[PDB]
UniProtKB/Swiss-Prot annotation, chain A:
Belongs to the resistance-nodulation-cell division (RND) (TC 2.A.6) family. It comes from the Bacteria. AcrA-AcrB-AcrZ-TolC is a drug efflux protein complex with broad substrate specificity that uses the proton motive force to export substrates. This is Multidrug efflux pump subunit AcrB. The lineage of its organism: Bacteria, Pseudomonadati, Pseudomonadota, Gammaproteobacteria, Enterobacterales. Disruption phenotype: Loss of susceptibility to contact-dependent growth inhibition (CDI); inhibiting cells still contact the target. Homotrimer, with large domains that extend into the periplasm, interacts with AcrA and TolC. AcrA may be required to stably link this protein and TolC. Interacts with AcrZ. Part of the AcrA-AcrB-AcrZ-TolC efflux pump. Induction: Positively regulated by MarA, Rob and SoxS transcriptional regulators (at protein level). It is found in: Cell inner membrane. It comes from Escherichia coli (strain K12).
Length: 48, 154
């Protein structure tokens, strides 16, 4: 899940302050590549 | 021997066989290899009717395995609200700690079963309760990012 990836500990500061992955990046499910975009009669779609 | 059939029955969820083996006076606190009573297996897999039938015949509610985990741990961890209430009604230790110092509140807070968290707190669960690493239920909610849970623990 995006929750578990978000709470990945990158390091801990000298004042016991944690720096997580969600504190330096956005976490979400997304395509391996965004190059291909298909439309069936102008309507959002995919295909084989 | 009868205690082994009760373990197999309690796990699978045979509500009939549990009663028949109980009638023949089978051990209600029959530990397996890892140290799980029928009440542990009933709490884990989620067999509410069997959990009550076991406790009815004086099943040890604060029985712990080789690592110190009570049925209330397994109930609170796998989001079995009805079982948690039944266990707590029969005098389950709400601040029960395993070898790691982890309480049912931590397991409830970690998986984020807010319905159970409130029941544990309402039965007198210590929010300040720390584990071996010095982590409260509040520390888990912030780290996990659950903010619905964070406000309940304050």
């Amino acid at each position: 899940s995006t929750e578990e990836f978000g709470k990945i500990l990158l390091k801990v500061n000298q004042d016991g302050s944690r720096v997580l992955l969600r504190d330096v990046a956005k976490i979400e499910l997304g395509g391996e590549n965004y190059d291909i975009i298909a439309e069936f009669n102008g309507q959002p779609a995919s295909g084989l | 021997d009868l205690g082994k059939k009760l373990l197999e029955a309690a796990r699978a969820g045979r509500d009939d066989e549990v009663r028949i083996l109980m009638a023949n006076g089978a051990d209600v606190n029959a530990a397996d290899v890892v140290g799980w009573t029928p009440l542990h297996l009933a709490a884990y897999w989620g067999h509410l009717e069997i959990v009550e039938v076991l406790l009815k015949n004086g099943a040890d509610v604060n029985a712990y395995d080789t690592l110190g985990s009570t049925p209330l741990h397994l109930a609170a961890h796998f989001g079995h609200l009805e079982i948690v209430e039944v266990l707590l009604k029969n005098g389950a230790d709400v601040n029960a700690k395993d070898d790691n110092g982890i309480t049912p509140l931590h397991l409830a807070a970690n998986r984020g079963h807010l319905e159970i968290v409130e029941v544990l707190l309402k039965y007198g669960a210590d929010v300040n309760a720390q584990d071996k690493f010095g982590k409260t239920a509040f520390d888990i909610s912030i780290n996990n990012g659950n903010e619905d849970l964070a406000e309940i623990l304050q």
